[PDB]
Paper text:
The N-terminal domains of p85α include an SH3 domain, capable of binding to proline-rich sequences, and a BH (breakpoint cluster region homology) domain. The BH domain can bind to and regulate several GTPases including [name], Rac1 and Cdc42. In addition, the p85α BH domain, either alone or together with the SH3 domain, can bind to and positively regulate [name] activity. The p85α BH domain also exhibits [name] GAP activity to stimulate [name]-mediated GTP hydrolysis required to inactivate [name]-mediated protein trafficking functions.
To determine if the patient-derived p85α BH domain mutations impacted the overall folded structure of the BH domain, several of these BH domain mutants were crystalized and their structures were determined using X-ray crystallography. X-ray diffraction data collection and structure refinement statistics for bovine p85α (105–319) mutants (E137K, E217K, R262T, E297K) are provided in Supplementary Table S1. In contrast, several of the p85α mutants (E137K, K288Q, E297K) showed near wild type binding to [name], and either had enhanced (K288Q) or reduced (E297K, E137K) ability to stimulate [name] lipid phosphatase activity. Three BH domain mutants, I177N, E217K and E297K, all showed significantly increased [name]-GAP activity, whereas the E137K mutant had reduced activity. The location of cancer patient-derived p85α BH mutations with significant impacts on [name] binding (I177, E217) and/or regulation (E137, I177, E217, E297) are shown in the modeled p85α BH domain: [name] complex. These mutation sites are located in regions of the p85α BH domain, well away from the [name] binding pocket. Further, crystal structure determinations for several of these mutant BH domains indicated that no major structural alterations were present. No significant differences in protein flexibility were observed for any of the mutant proteins, suggesting that the mutations did not alter the rigidity of the domain.
Residue numbers in the entry:
A (entry chain A): 113 to 167, 172 to 298
B (entry chain B): 113 to 167, 172 to 275, 281 to 297
Write the structure that this text describes.
Amino acid sequence: STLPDLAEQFAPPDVAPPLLIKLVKAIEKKGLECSTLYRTQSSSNPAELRQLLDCLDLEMFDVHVLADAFKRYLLDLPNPVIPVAVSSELISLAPEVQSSEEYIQLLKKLIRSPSIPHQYWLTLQYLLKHFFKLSQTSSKNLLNARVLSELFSPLLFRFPAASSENTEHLIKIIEILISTEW
Amino acid sequence: STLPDLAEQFAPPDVAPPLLIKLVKAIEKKGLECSTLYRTQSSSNPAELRQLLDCLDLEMFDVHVLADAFKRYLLDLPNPVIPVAVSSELISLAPEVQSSEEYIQLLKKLIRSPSIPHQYWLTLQYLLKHFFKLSQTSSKNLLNARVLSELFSPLLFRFENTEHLIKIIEILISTE
């Protein structure tokens, strides 16, 4: 649990944590068309994956190890990419305020709060771009935006919560944000 | 004001915001012996000072304008160098605590909290180093740790109930 806060790992004008960029670039180089990328576990345990998140070129590793280390990274951030402040608010929204557009508007307003370092929103945007690029070779890797949201929303929000029509709505906006990256 | 959070202006391994470093270096080059540094209002208004903080060599500017822009910078940070949570805790202990060394140990403990980006403490240390350097020519600029603490504690904490905070800064300047 020695991964520094996102706000300490980089600062503007950099667009993302340098370790995260290395992971994403290696994964895209070696696994863009992999039909089980992020949907199978590798043999490495969390301690070994954490050991990798310190030291070599990440392209030297097995792609399934890199993919697991990507998840491990999202899980080990001291605060999640989408801070609990933001998700606590989004979950509290009523059924009458049910437009995905409104949920997205609120997520951007809350995460861009000056009470939240810009690094959180920057990292989320970088991850969305990766997820969008993956979904554009769906014909080969079988990943659409919705499945990528179902796989990664629990790692982005890190929020235990019964399956509400609120939680469906958070998966839905991530789904929309992946698809609408350009 | 569009000044970004301390945590957005730099990240480890850099030791301080690059704009703050530029200000400090220019002020120390041109004003180390100035008997009125940081105690005189210059002719510029906050908008003009912000224009200078929003961007070329800062040495071209009048030193009193640099000193004003340094204060403007500290005032315009979206969150103060010493976060409000930290200062609120130190203030609420005020009648029950009074060991100064305890206040200092606590200030450091609170500002190094994992919930607070390391940039806040890094920036505070950079500021303390500058304040200490000034105090080493106090015979000429008249800025000793106590005067520096009275001038800048209100900008660092962003605030009677406060005298123990001023003393913390005074001691932290002296022991650099």
